[PDB]
Design a protein around this ligand. Structure first.
Ligand code: HEM
Ligand code: HEM
Ligand SMILES: Nc1nc2c(c(=O)[nH]1)N[C@H]1C(S)=C(S)[C@@H](COP(=O)(O)O)O[C@H]1N2
Ligand SMILES: Nc1nc2c(c(=O)[nH]1)N[C@H]1C(S)=C(S)[C@@H](COP(=O)(O)O)O[C@H]1N2
Ligand SMILES: [Mo]
Ligand SMILES: [Mo]
Lengths: 463, 458
């Protein structure tokens, strides 16, 4: 008595005129008429249009209670049917890419690059897997579990070939909660100064998850490498994704970080308690805590030890910072170091730019984070464009010294006067007392990476 | 043949009327008349007035040549003679008169800014000095270093034992006071603290025992569960008996890479009295406050040092905090310092000649993070050029020493410049544009861009 629909067909209903449909479990709901009845307005609920409620239920667990579910059942109109998963490259190179939640803010479809709606970013310490930002340079690899092999070699160690099963049984499983931030986060603020090359990220190219897997340290020691090597040695990684020419995505990290127990570098097979999603590297990815997202290679195929940095294009000719004076005709990637640890950062996630907020009390919220395991010791929040500041409340548990891999969510509730204008700014300070710079121009660079000047959000107060 | 004078006497002769006297070796020279004949002008030579030429000779080795030593010998006027609670500072060591002194009792001073980046290693005589108390008079033979803590064998090391039981390690490290550049903070709103300019920072090659080796020798383990600390106590104390003290996390004390030393040598000689004789702690990449001088005790503890200066000083606060709301429990003790840089050449208000101008300075970052770039502006931060970084590369994570930089640029007659510098470290940390947003009641952690205005001779 209930018509069946595919995830794809449900994704066609994302608007009132079209009808707003959402899914939960294997049920399909038409909540067009409910949007106006939703507590807190339609702004958040409409973020789920055409897709699953799952991730949003994880952010706001009150929806899991019986009374909310009983309300939701009033809007049921169908059921989902298993999605067939078909014959690569006939249609196109990205034809086998996994489906994604429609609530993501996509800035590139082929290759797929997207960030979750900024208002949801600092609503939960662990970012739901369906909303975790995604950055793909190439088509997503389609991997058959049983035949996948991770190759590990290099000078001083034999040559291993580990199946997913062996990775899971041979090495003790460790979990590390770590925030991944792309080098291009907040690149859109760089473009306001002068046009740059790169994906036009807003403040959401950063997400946090509890990663589970083998320690890189343990796998390399098993391969026979020593705990320490004299001089500057590197651990190079190569993914299963490659361009038409055959060069795979690759990156490396210093050998010292790879072998250090406290550095928590993992060969992760689990993400937020479940198997790694395809977009995030199924079956295995490197996770390098405190280091720019580019080095956390997904769809891992090879691990090697070398006296030199990875020769990959992305290690050598991308992801570097330059003086603001450098232009395409003078840029020389030999003159700057590959980005490994990232500088202190923060952004306001609530309210959003252009909002008109009710007078009285306003709760300002956001995230703050610093690379290299350096914790956030304070976040300063201004309502007047950075003239005067108040200290925000830092949420969450502290971590051991030098191992603050996860962001600090913060919030501050402040009184706001009817009919005024606000310019809301946040800036964070880390455990080495490094701070964020006032403006973007002086840190501008042609690729628009390393965008950490204060985040400024303009809103008005209603009357 | 020659009258003999003490250093104190020679320090009274620093001008034409009193006569300008300087020393070299054990000789005293009256160079009053030679000041006008000194190549380059009187400015430089007069910096040494009343004191030793040694430190300056080290900055400019051209002075080591035969003709310079010979040119000086004709001005000899004499020879140097060696050597209660009403004045607790009566026992302090003599200092070079060329230092820029901000406090005499207790003694706190910095070298002239123009000399700071003139040599990678700062001569011992010019190395900035920060004393909270009177300097301890220590007899070498009877000096003992106490080491103790839970799970370790109590040690009582003499200087000789500190030199022989532990393999000597040498670490070149820059010490920077938390108040360096405080004067830029004062400009915005008055703060509490010594009025340092840009010279509360200096660099030396330190030599001593690794703290790690001493602790291991006592039986302490490489790692302790939870957050443990290593506390230091100096021999200097207030009138009530509380000694200067500080601490560093246990993890840093035991790390082989952290290079923390129990130093007994500074730039090749024994530690000067003002810099901790006979032994000081040197904590590379960490604020000067933690490098306890005149070390008397090393203790392992589950808690941070209870000292006043570890608990109720040397911390950073929001710019909104004032004396009526400051609460030292709300911030962490300063350990690693943030990226920093300053222009040492030209000096503020100078009138430089048209043509080419060489701008020079220093740059450094804490935590062993090397300086990867220094941007220099001549138009107040609108446009920037990249400076040349001098110095030798250090191993990743172990860049404890500053990077001296320079940039030569063409300057037009009759112009006005606003020279600005900013540095970037290897975790790509950067310095903030302005001082107001990082202001704090103690004026510490002053790392906004350094701005120097000068004019070009028309
Ligand atoms: C058709 C699906 C949905 C239904 C039936 C629903 C229903 C409800 C109900 C009954 C409450 C009040 C709970 C209580 O405290 O008793 C609530 C609150 C809330 N819901 Fe939903 N919701 C839906 C979808 C969503 C989605 C997708 C989001 C976020 C993307 C969301 C965000 C919120 C928030 C933020 C509140 C908090 C209260 C406030 O707005 O001030 N809801 N919702
Ligand atoms: C009585 C003590 C001194 C004597 C006899 C002396 C003598 C000289 C002589 C002979 C030269 C030229 C060497 C050559 O042939 O290249 C010279 C150069 C120089 N001296 Fe001294 N000097 C004295 C003190 C100082 C001091 C204390 C300073 C530093 C603060 C200083 C800074 C310099 C500099 C910077 C130059 C190079 C000039 C330039 O850049 O054009 N001198 N001095
Ligand atoms: N194999 C492979 N790994 C990769 C990439 C890639 O394109 N291929 N993108 C990198 C970059 S630049 C980032 S920011 C992170 C993003 O991870 P995520 O998609 O799971 O958020 O993956 C890194 N790992
Ligand atoms: N025992 C003792 N150690 C000390 C101090 C002190 O007053 N007593 N001053 C500290 C501070 S605040 C600094 S900045 C450095 C300065 O070292 P220096 O004088 O050798 O330059 O010493 C540190 N070590
Ligand atoms: Mo990235
Ligand atoms: Mo200091």
């Amino acid at each position: 008595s209930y018509p069946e629909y595919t995830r794809e067909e449900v994704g066609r209903h994302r608007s009132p005129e079209e009808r707003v449909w959402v899914t939960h479990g294997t049920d399909v709901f038409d909540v067009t008429d409910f949007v106006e009845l939703h507590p807190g307005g339609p702004d958040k609920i409409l973020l789920a249009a055409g897709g699953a409620l799952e991730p949003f239920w994880a952010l706001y667990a009150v929806h899991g209670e019986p009374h909310v579910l009983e309300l939701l059942q009033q809007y049921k109109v169908g059921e989902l049917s298993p999605d067939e998963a078909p014959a690569p490259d006939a249609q196109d190179p990205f034809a086998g890419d996994p489906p994604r939640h429609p609530g993501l803010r996509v800035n590139s479809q082929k290759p797929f690059n997207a960030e979750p709606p900024a208002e949801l970013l600092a609503e939960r310490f662990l970012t739901p897997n369906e909303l975790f930002f995604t950055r793909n340079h190439l088509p997503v690899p389609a991997v058959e579990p049983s035949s996948y092999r991770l190759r590990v070699d290099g000078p001083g160690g034999g040559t291993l070939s580990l199946s997913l099963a062996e990775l899971r049984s041979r090495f003790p499983k460790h979990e590390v909660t770590a925030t991944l931030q792309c080098a291009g986060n907040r690149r859109s603020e760089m473009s306001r100064v002068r046009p740059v090359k790169g994906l036009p990220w807003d403040i959401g190219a950063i997400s946090t998850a509890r990663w589970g897997g083998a320690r890189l340290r343990d796998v390399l020691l098993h391969a026979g490498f020593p705990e320490e090597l004299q001089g500057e040695w590197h651990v190079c990684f190569e993914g299963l994704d490659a361009d038409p020419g055959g060069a795979p995505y690759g990156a490396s990290i210093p050998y010292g970080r790879a072998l250090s127990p406290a550095a928590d570098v993992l060969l992760a097979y689990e993400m937020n308690g479940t198997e790694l999603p395809r977009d995030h590297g199924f079956p295995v990815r490197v996770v390098v805590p405190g280091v720019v997202g580019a080095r956390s290679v997904k769809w891992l195929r090879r691990v090697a030890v070398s006296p030199d940095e990875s020769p990959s294009h992305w290690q050598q000719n991308d992801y570097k910072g330059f003086s603001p004076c450098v232009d395409w005709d003078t840029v020389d990637y030999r003159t700057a170091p590959a980005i490994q640890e990232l500088p202190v950062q923060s952004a306001v996630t609530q309210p959003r730019p252009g909002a008109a907020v009710p007078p009285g009390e306003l709760t300002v919220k956001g995230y703050a984070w610093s690379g290299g395991g350096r914790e956030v010791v304070r976040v300063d929040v201004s309502l007047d464009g950075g003239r005067t500041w108040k200290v925000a409340r830092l949420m969450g548990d502290k971590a051991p010294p030098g191992r603050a891999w996860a962001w600090a969510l913060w919030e501050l509730t402040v009184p706001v006067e009817a009919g005024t204008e606000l310019e809301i700014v946040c800036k964070a300070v880390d455990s080495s007392y490094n701070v964020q710079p006032d403006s973007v121009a002086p840190i501008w660079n042609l690729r628009g990476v390393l965008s950490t000047a204060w985040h400024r959000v303009r809103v008005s107060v209603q009357d």
